[PDB]
């Protein structure tokens, strides 16, 4: 179907302890493929997927220089935003940047985005037309005026509709064996009596990809959202994901409840009953 | 490939 390439930047200032900590990571869909850590010994952009190691030495030299310059851009931005908010030199602060592009099944550009944060809340973001910015507060309005005068939106749009879409296609081609796959979840169910009159039914879903999935409970065919525990989707560590959903049922009525599993890799939504 | 535009904030 659709596919995405996304980069995530994190810059954390360390007052009195040297340069800020800069970490960059690249994703194709839910699969990390590159990383840079400013505190690592290599001081290089590093591969994190087998299919990206095909790139020649020009690729890694280029990305290393480009991501190192980004670390300096954020270092200066930390100082500038530290002045915008009248903050002291002692506190540690964070800048986060997310950006990327999406392509449809025809391989053509579908959508682009870029979003920046400061201390874990919105700062500035490129609008969906890729021609204007939304600023979260008065400080970000200063950044917005600089970015308009410098034609940053047009420069960002030319990357999003050009090199981003182009290299995302090459990546999808190189890692065609693993990026274009849909592993269905393996489902089972556990039962734990908690008291003399109640019990816990837990519905499991393991080894699925991509990460999106819907685990819902029903009682006598009626969806029940009460007494429902639902943890976040977690990575198994091998590219697949895990999730479970549990309900507290009265003892003896366990067979009145059904679990329903919906995933992209399933030809028909699964139904489970104890 | 990376490509965040780096106009100073």
């Amino acid at each position: 179907g659709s596919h995405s390439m996304r980069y995530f930047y994190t810059s954390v200032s360390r007052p009195g302890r040297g340069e800020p900590r800069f970490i960059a990571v690249g994703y194709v869909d839910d699969t990390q493929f590159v990383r840079f850590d400013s505190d690592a010994a290599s001081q290089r952009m590093e591969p994190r997927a087998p299919w990206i190691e095909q790139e020649g030495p020009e690729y890694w030299d280029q990305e290393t220089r480009n991501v190192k310059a980004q670390s300096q851009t954020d270092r200066v931005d930390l100082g500038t935003l530290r002045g915008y908010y009248n903050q002291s030199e002692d506190g540690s602060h964070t800048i986060q940047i997310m950006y990327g592009c999406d392509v449809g099944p025809d391989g053509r550009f579908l959508r682009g985005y870029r979003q920046d944060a400061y201390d874990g809340k919105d700062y500035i973001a490129l609008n969906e037309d890729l021609r204007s910015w939304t600023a979260a507060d008065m400080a970000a309005q200063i950044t917005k005026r600089k970015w308009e005068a410098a034609h940053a939106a047009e420069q960002q749009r030319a990357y999003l509709e050009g090199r981003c879409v182009e290299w995302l296609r090459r990546y999808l081609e190189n890692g065609k064996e693993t990026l274009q796959r849909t592993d269905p979840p393996k489902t089972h169910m556990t039962h734990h009596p908690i008291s003399d009159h109640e019990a816990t039914l837990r519905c499991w879903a393991l080894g699925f990809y991509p990460a999106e999935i819907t685990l819902t409970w029903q009682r006598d065919g009626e969806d029940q959202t009460q007494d429902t525990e639902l943890v976040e989707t977690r990575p198994a560590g091998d590219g697949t994901f895990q999730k479970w959903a549990a309900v507290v049922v009265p003892s003896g009525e366990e067979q009145r409840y059904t679990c329903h599993v919906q995933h992209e890799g399933l030809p028909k939504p699964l139904t489970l009953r104890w | 490939v990376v490509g965040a535009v780096g106009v100073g904030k």
Partner: T-cell receptor
Amino acid sequence: KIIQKPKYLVAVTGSEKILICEQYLGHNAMYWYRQSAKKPLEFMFSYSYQMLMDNQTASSRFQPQSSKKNHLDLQITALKPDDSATYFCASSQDRGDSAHTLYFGSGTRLTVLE
Amino acid sequence: KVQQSPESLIVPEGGMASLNCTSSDRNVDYFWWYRQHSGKSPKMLMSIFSNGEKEEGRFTVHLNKASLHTSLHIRDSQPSDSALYLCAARSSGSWQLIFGSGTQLTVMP
């Protein structure tokens, strides 16, 4: 604006010279270009935050000096008469891949003589 | 990489001056027009980052991203406009302006 010294410079074949360039505008990118009768503006060096970003001089005899902030001096060893040209220093507020306007210094006219 | 046309142009005072500039890099999405008087430094005249015309005084810059083409129109040409006009591009991802061979414009009083 941007200070370049000296205005004129003469050198013999095989000597070394240093072209000085400094800006006090808080600009985060500095560049070197060369102007000859052949090519009016050949790009040489691009620096962002004192780090080397790109170099389109096929000769290793050109060695910029960027250890000090706001400076991008250019040292040229084993000078040749083909190096005779006006060398323009340039700077811009934002880093090299994102700048919207380049400001050019007054230039150093270099003549290498046999 | 950046091609300019024509190499030299002589225009009478008050006449029209049309300068052309194309690129072969598909990743070029914008251009700069610089002007350099004899013995001076090159100074930026016009920049353009989107398709269409952009007018400032007697100068109009045109951008055609499809044909990778930019043109500088000078109306009511004055003798002070006599200079070397330089076209520059910077493909997405690269770190410097790359200039063309220039058009030498001479406006006779």
